[PDB]
């Protein structure tokens, strides 16, 4: 049992390691402090289980000092309010109105455990991280080409997930209805039950078809060989067969696999087509072939398409864990994610302490690349914010 970081470890991380300035500049959207930070809600989770909401900081130093004094296990970022949330007790409950928050998406491994074999329970490795990687790829595809968003970044959840922070002025100002609309556009797999055929609407929406084409080359390499979940006959019956449309085909495949146990996922995938060809004959064979292809595509999407957490995105007032936070159980830093990121690459707080013992400087530790990446992202966001202000001024004239 690897114990999580101690309270003294959290104090050390907060006093010497947290990139407080970069987070402040990211959330402030301006080099100078503004109401985007003074009126931002922050919620702090303590080791005792206490949860204190509606905290706010006026400056860079105030943020660092309050976080150091509180020493929470983690803290979460809220929306911009019309009034400082820290002054809530002097205000009526109806006076604090949320006005802006970054669009947020949460993806976890929990919805993919039915299709992975390289890890069990709450474990994670590079093999299963391909699910999250494809999820970010598809989500970024949608956000970039369909919504026109530019300033978004992915951050490791700490154990096996990732959070998306869309900081576009258009995305930040979305109402709850608009956020629900974007989520429903992205959340194709509404029913996560693997024991039932999706029966997705046909013809595919261009986003759905594009995602299917993007995911098709990876379906073999991941599912049929690396994970190989349908080698087990019981797992095959539980997850692969229910995605088929024809009862006769399902029964025939079940009997064939009972007579020939432990056929691998690729072999079962080919058996589906072979038995379907043997069964469906005559002038109606083309419809059966088309329906089988549709079911196979639906299973590809069920197995590889992003499975978002739908609550966190719906409302402007929802709180989400801030980046660079320490995961209490693993000690991993919630670092930003690039194309080469894997869960084993996230620095651990104890390792950062060991590095700081040799070199008492954050710039010489393993946390530094992620800090640099975040700083570049913040700089680009600020440049785009200035451009948007100029465009608004031009439009008003």
């Amino acid at each position: 049992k690897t114990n999580g970081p101690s309270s003294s470890d959290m104090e050390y991380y907060y006093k010497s390691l947290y990139p407080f300035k970069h987070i402040f500049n990211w959330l402030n959207h301006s080099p100078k402090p503004s109401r985007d930070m003074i009126n931002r809600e922050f919620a702090m989770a303590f080791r005792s289980g206490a949860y204190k909401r509606y905290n706010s900081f006026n400056s860079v130093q105030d943020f660092k000092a309050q976080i150091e004094k509180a020493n929470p296990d983690r803290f979460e970022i809220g929306a911009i309010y019309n009034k400082p949330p820290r002054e809530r007790d002097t205000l009526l409950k109806s006076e604090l109105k949320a006005l802006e928050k970054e669009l947020v998406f949460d993806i976890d491994m929990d919805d993919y455990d039915a299709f992975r074999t390289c890890c069990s329970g709450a474990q994670v490795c590079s093999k299963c991280w391909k699910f999250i990687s494809l999820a970010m790829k598809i989500t970024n595809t949608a956000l970039r080409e369909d919504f026109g968003y530019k300033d978004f970044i992915w951050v490791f959840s700490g154990r096996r997930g990732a959070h998306c922070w869309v900081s576009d002025k258009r995305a930040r100002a979305l109402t709850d209805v608009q956020r629900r609309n974007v989520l429903d556009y992205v959340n194709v797999i509404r029913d996560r039950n693997t024991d039932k055929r999706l029966a997705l609407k046909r013809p595919y929406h261009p986003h759905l078809a594009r995602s299917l084409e993007q995911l098709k080359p990876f379906f073999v390499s991941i599912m049929l060989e690396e994970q190989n979940p349908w080698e087990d006959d019981q797992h095959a019956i539980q997850t692969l067969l229910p995605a088929l449309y024809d009862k006769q085909l399902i029964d025939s495949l079940k009997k064939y696999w009972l007579d020939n146990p432990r056929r691998s996922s690729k072999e079962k995938w080919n058996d589906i087509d072979q038995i379907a060809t043997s069964l469906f004959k005559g002038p109606k064979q083309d419809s059966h072939i088309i329906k089988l292809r549709e079911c196979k595509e639906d299973l590809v999407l069920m197995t590889l398409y992003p499975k978002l957490d739908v609550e966190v995105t719906k409302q402007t007032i929802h709180l989400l864990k801030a980046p660079f936070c320490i995961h209490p159980a693993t000690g991993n830093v919630c670092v930003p994610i690039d194309e080469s990121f894997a869960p084993e690459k996230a620095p651990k707080l104890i390792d950062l302490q060991t590095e700081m013992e040799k070199n008492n400087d954050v710039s010489l530790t393993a946390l530094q690349p992620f800090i640099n990446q975040f700083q570049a992202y913040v700089s680009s966001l600020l440049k785009n914010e200035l451009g948007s202000v100029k465009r608004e001024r031009e439009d008003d004239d």
Binding site: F147, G148, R170, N181
Partner: protein, 450 residues
């Protein structure tokens, strides 16, 4: 304005057969024109509302309304008078319904549905001319995105325009134009994946967005008209018509047969209540006596049979002598029939005039039960009429919204298979009864030849 200049402006406005009603009509119309056009458009909207409350399909509502269009508000005509009728009726109803929020909501909903129907009845060329009259994409941009746009819109085409063949769908798509707008304005269509999205822009289902913009603009203009109404309050001439229009949204028959079950099955619940009160108390107060007498006259009861009816009902308990009945009541009953005074043939009270009544107190039986009875008591008699619990719940939901006439129509329909008049209810029930009797007689005749 010269008549010629007025016609020129109106033609510039109607370049399309459909309008957003952006600019106020200019010109003078007579009071008869004012009230008649207002009442005709109001009837069209009320029929729309009645169809909607019954969950009728769009095609059924269109089919019902087309003859009403040809009769009351002719559309797709080149006559300037019909277009003037539509425009002035719309703006008169704007004046009528701007007073209250609920009236505004009902008006904008009905008017948006009317807009939808009218747009659906237009030709595709006329629809294109109207939408051209919200930036359209160039043909090059359509060609670049043609595959994605066709994939998005193929299902909408198949299910809305019944273009089952792929060739017809492609041929229509080649002629279809698309509008590029931010997805925030069409988030509703984005949710159902009916519109193509690229770089934050939604490519358009156009009827839905057009209806949404029309409803928003109509809401705003109603608000402005409500702000400007008190300046119009100085016109003594229009106020009564506006008030009436706003509130408008809310020997077989003789003295003995009117009590019989054959005739008693046909009355509406108000009339049954008044007759039950008369039977129990052998007396009805002024408003109840007036309502009952005018109904009875409207259903065919002559004056002499009315006098016999009233005398027999009143003298049954012995508390009233015939001398007192002749001294106090005979004159009023004859007057109701136009036999006394100025000989004015009083018309029977519709639902609206009954509701304009002053609320029944203790001992009163007049008014409308659906407005004046408690929910438990109404449930009691509706159970007595062999209505199911779901039907009773629907009727009570209609009563709670203030749609008492809607609930009257509902109880009519459940007990027999839009009514705004007791005599209309009686007449429809009588016609259905005679039709059923004729069908039964025909069945008996057919079963006797085998």
């Amino acid at each position: 304005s010269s008549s010629e200049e007025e016609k020129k402006l109106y033609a510039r406005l109607y370049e399309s057969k459909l309008s957003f009603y952006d600019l106020p009509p200019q010109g003078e119309i007579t009071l008869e024109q004012f009230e008649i056009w207002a009442i005709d458009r109001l009837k069209i909207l009320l029929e729309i509302e009645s169809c909607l409350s019954r969950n009728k399909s769009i095609k059924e509502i269109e089919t019902i309304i087309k003859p009403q269009f040809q009769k009351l508000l002719p559309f797709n005509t080149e006559s300037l008078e019909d277009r003037k009728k539509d425009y002035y009726s719309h703006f008169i109803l704007r004046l009528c319904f701007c007073r209250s929020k609920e009236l505004r909501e009902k008006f904008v909903r009905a008017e948006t549905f009317l807009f939808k129907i009218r747009f659906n009845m237009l030709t595709s060329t006329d629809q294109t001319k109207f939408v051209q009259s919200l930036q359209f994409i160039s043909n090059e941009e359509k060609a670049e995105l043609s595959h994605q746009l066709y994939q998005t819109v193929s299902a909408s085409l198949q299910f809305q325009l019944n273009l089952n063949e792929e060739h017809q769908r492609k041929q229509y798509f080649q002629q279809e134009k698309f509008i590029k707008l931010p997805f925030e304005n069409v988030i509703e269509l984005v949710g159902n994946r009916l519109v193509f999205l690229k770089d934050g822009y939604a490519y358009l289902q156009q009827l839905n967005l057009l209806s949404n913009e029309f409803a928003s603009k109509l809401n705003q203009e109603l608000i402005k008209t409500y702000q400007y109404l008190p300046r119009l309050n100085e016109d003594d001439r229009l106020l009564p018509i506006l008030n009436h229009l706003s509130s408008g949204y809310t020997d077989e028959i003789n003295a003995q047969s009117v009590w019989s079950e054959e005739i008693s099955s046909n009355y509406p619940l108000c009339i049954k209540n008044l007759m039950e009160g008369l039977k129990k108390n052998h007396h009805l107060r002024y408003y109840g006596r007036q309502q009952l007498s005018l109904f009875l006259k409207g259903i065919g009861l002559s004056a002499d049979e009315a006098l016999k009816f009233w005398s027999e009902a009143f003298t049954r308990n012995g508390n009233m002598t015939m001398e007192k009945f002749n001294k106090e009541y005979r004159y009023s009953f004859r007057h109701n029939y136009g036999l006394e005074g100025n000989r004015i043939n009083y018309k029977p009270w519709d639902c609206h005039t009954i509701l304009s009544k002053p609320r029944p107190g203790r001992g009163d039986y007049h008014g409308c039960p659906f407005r004046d009875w408690s929910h438990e008591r109404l449930s009691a008699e509706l159970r007595s009429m062999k209505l199911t619990q779901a039907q009773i719940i629907s009727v009570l939901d209609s009563c709670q919204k203030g749609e008492y006439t809607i609930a009257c129509t509902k109880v009519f329909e459940m007990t027999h298979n839009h009514i705004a008049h007791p005599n209309l209810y009686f007449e429809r029930s009588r016609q259905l009864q005679k039709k059923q009797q004729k069908l039964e007689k025909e069945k008996l005749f057919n079963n006797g030849n085998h």
